[PDB]
Amino acid sequence: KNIIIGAMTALITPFKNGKVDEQSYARLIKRQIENGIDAVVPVGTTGESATLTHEEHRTCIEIAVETCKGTKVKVLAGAGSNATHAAVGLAKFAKEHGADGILSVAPYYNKPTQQGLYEHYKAIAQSVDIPVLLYNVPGRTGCEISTDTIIKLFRDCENIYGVKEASGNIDKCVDLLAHEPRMMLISGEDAINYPILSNGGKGVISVTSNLLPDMISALTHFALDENYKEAKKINDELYNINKILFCESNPIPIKTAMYLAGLIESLEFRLPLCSPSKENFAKIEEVMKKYKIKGF
Amino acid sequence: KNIIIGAMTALITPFKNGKVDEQSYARLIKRQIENGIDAVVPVGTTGESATLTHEEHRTCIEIAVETCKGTKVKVLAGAGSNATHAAVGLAKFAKEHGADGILSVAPYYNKPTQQGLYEHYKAIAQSVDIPVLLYNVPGRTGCEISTDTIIKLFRDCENIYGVKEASGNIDKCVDLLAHEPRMMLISGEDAINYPILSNGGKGVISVTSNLLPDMISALTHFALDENYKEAKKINDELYNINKILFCESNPIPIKTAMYLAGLIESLEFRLPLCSPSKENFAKIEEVMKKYKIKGF
Ligand SMILES: N[C@@H](CCCC[NH3+])C(=O)O
Ligand SMILES: N[C@@H](CCCC[NH3+])C(=O)O
Ligand SMILES: [Mg+2]
Ligand SMILES: [Mg+2]
Ligand SMILES: [Mg+2]
Ligand SMILES: [Mg+2]
Ligand SMILES: [Mg+2]
Ligand SMILES: [Mg+2]
Ligand SMILES: [Mg+2]
Ligand SMILES: [Mg+2]
Ligand SMILES: [Mg+2]
Ligand SMILES: [Mg+2]
Ligand SMILES: [Mg+2]
Numbered sequence: 001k002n003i004i005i006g007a008m009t010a011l012i013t014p015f016k017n018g019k020v021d022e023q024s025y026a027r028l029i030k031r032q033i034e035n036g037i038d039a040v041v042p043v044g045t046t047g048e049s050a051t052l053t054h055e056e057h058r059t060c061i062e063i064a065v066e067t068c069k070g071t072k073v074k075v076l077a078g079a080g081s082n083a084t085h086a087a088v089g090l091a092k093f094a095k096e097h098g099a100d101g102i103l104s105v106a107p108y109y110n111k112p113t114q115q116g117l118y119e120h121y122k123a124i125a126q127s128v129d130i131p132v133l134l135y136n137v138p139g140r141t142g143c144e145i146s147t148d149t150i151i152k153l154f155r156d157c158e159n160i161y162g163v164k165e166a167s168g169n170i171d172k173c174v175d176l177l178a179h180e181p182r183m184m185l186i187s188g189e190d191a192i193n194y195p196i197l198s199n200g201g202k203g204v205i206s207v208t209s210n211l212l213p214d215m216i217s218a219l220t221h222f223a224l225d226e227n228y229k230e231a232k233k234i235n236d237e238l239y240n241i242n243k244i245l246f247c248e249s250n251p252i253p254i255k256t257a258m259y260l261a262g263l264i265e266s267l268e269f270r271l272p273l274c275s276p277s278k279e280n281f282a283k284i285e286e287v288m289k290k291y292k293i294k295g296f
Numbered sequence: 297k298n299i300i301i302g303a304m305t306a307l308i309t310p311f312k313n314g315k316v317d318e319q320s321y322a323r324l325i326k327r328q329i330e331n332g333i334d335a336v337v338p339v340g341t342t343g344e345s346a347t348l349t350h351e352e353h354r355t356c357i358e359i360a361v362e363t364c365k366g367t368k369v370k371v372l373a374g375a376g377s378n379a380t381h382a383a384v385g386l387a388k389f390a391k392e393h394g395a396d397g398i399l400s401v402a403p404y405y406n407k408p409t410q411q412g413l414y415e416h417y418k419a420i421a422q423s424v425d426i427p428v429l430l431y432n433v434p435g436r437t438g439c440e441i442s443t444d445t446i447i448k449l450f451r452d453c454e455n456i457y458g459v460k461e462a463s464g465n466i467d468k469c470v471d472l473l474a475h476e477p478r479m480m481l482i483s484g485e486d487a488i489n490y491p492i493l494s495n496g497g498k499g500v501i502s503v504t505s506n507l508l509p510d511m512i513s514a515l516t517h518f519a520l521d522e523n524y525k526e527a528k529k530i531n532d533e534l535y536n537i538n539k540i541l542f543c544e545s546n547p548i549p550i551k552t553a554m555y556l557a558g559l560i561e562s563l564e565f566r567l568p569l570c571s572p573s574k575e576n577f578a579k580i581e582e583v584m585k586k587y588k589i590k591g592f
Binding site: 105 | 341344345378379381403404405406407408409412413415416419435436438544545548566568572573
């Protein structure tokens with residue numbers, strides 16, 4: 001199977017005057033490239049998928065593909081939707097516009113059954129010929145892709161090569177790789193990047209890497225080389241920022257941190273997302289002081 | 297405040313050859329009207345909001361407004377979205393096309409903060425001049441509209457007159473009506489319709505009423521007339537069907553029941569929703585046999 005692994009970043013989507021700051025977007029991805037990141041994920045949850053139009057969603061995928069051309073960095077395009085027809089459309093767009101693969105979040109709100117999830121991802125996988133990474137985050141979607149369903153999709157579909165797990169369930173992470181060791185388990189929860197990697201996970205799709213790409217990059221590559229003492233040291237070191245970046249709902253804290261670091265021009269969200277509390281703003285600002293934040 | 301209360305139905309959306317069966321849709325609404333229902337809710341969760349296009353979502357609102365014209369039955373149009381700009385657009389469409397009010401689900405997937413929920417609903421309420429009913433269903437959205445936020449929105453926004461609660465939290469329903477007794481608490485949980493009404497709730501937005509509109513209507517009207525013994529009697533009798541209609545994720549069981557009752561033409565969903573397992577199909581069919589289903 002073709003895979004996309006290593007250190008990956010769930011890209012924030014900067015706004016300027018209520019519109020996607022496409023030049024800031026390209027600059028941020030380009031900063032990621034220059035700091036050891038292996039792949040970028042445009043328009044995930046962290047990229048405010050929900051509030052982008054289908055045209056802006058597609059524009060962000062294009063900017064990512066263009067910016068990464070001529071580099072080793074891959075584009076794992078965010079292509080999820082709770083409507084199968086729409087997820088297939090995003091998958092086909094990403095394939096036709098040069099993405100190396102797609103991430104596809106489990107359908108949110110409408111809570112499909114395991115059978116429905118299987119048919120949902122199989123239709124997505126059959127629509128294109130690029131790798132497809134499942135994305136399980138039950139706290140946001142209201143549904144869970146079971147281990148059995150994940151393993152079935154991995155074995156039944158050629159392009160489905162693994163899962164990004166944001167479920168706080170290291171037991172499930174053991175379950176997955178003990179019964180199907182060929183799949184690529186990707187950490188979608190920064191605080192436990194090292195435990196997932198140390199159990200045979202092969203990469204991360206990180207929120208923290210938006211702010212500290214070099215540290216997340218080093219952590220992942222240390223761990224992939226089985227340098228667990230160095231990988232764990234970084235993971236323990238990052239715990240404080242990893243947790244404070246979810247003081248409020250992601251991506252509210254990470255965008256707050258990027259703004260405080262001078263990496264984006266304005267602390268702008270699209271409703272229903274909003275600025276952090278004044279208190280959490282100060283808490284984010286205080287935790288950042290213990291870290292070396294790279295500029296451009 | 298301007299209000300829409302009483303017995304209300306979260307309308308299923310019948311599909312025929314992958315398209316909205318518009319003549320069946322109108323026929324089902326007239327069946328609701330003829331069985332004592334006070335209002336209909338087009339395109340909720342039960343109406344497969346997630347997988348309808350904007351054109352379809354809008355068409356279903358039109359059919360409901362249009363079919364209920366000349367009757368006492370009101371149209372509480374489903375207008376929720378996890379993107380505030382889209383929720384404002386749906387609200388404005390419903391107002392301009394003759395809906396009596398709108399239902400608006402709390403944003404799903406992107407998990408706004410309480411401040412974000414307030415600004416989300418404030419923007420919706422200011423966009424129209426018709427009543428707005430909040431909709432809290434944390435098991436599907438991943439977020440909760442707190443009691444304080446609901447009460448603030450009720451007091452600060454003219455159009456916001458209550459909430460449809462689908463949270464299995466009768467404590468919160470006491471909390472809401474003890475601190476703000478003027479709001480219209482609406483049950484969004486069929487199994488506990490009577491307990492919510494007996495504590496001062498003023499209506500239901502029912503899934504079960506799709507199949508048994510006469511029974512849900514009678515339950516609500518018994519309770520509103522303070523005949524709690526008869527309202528509880530129907531609630532107790534309906535428990536078995538109320539539960540089996542969620543053996544799988546709504547609206548998979550209710551559409552199965554409507555199809556088994558001969559009320560719709562095909563057991564058709566849009567992916568990622570799918571037909572139930574063969575057990576739950578058989579379980580739904582067996583529970584239905586103990587209830588008298590009205591025809592057309
Ligand atoms: N707000 C909708 C539409 C998003 C379209 C662009 N990703 C959703 O989250 O599914
Ligand atoms: N699937 C998207 C778009 C649906 C728009 C029509 N109701 C959502 O659930 O938000
Ligand atoms: Mg555009
Ligand atoms: Mg996705
Ligand atoms: Mg979508
Ligand atoms: Mg399809
Ligand atoms: Mg090495
Ligand atoms: Mg600054
Ligand atoms: Mg009436
Ligand atoms: Mg709604
Ligand atoms: Mg009253
Ligand atoms: Mg079966
Ligand atoms: Mg079964």
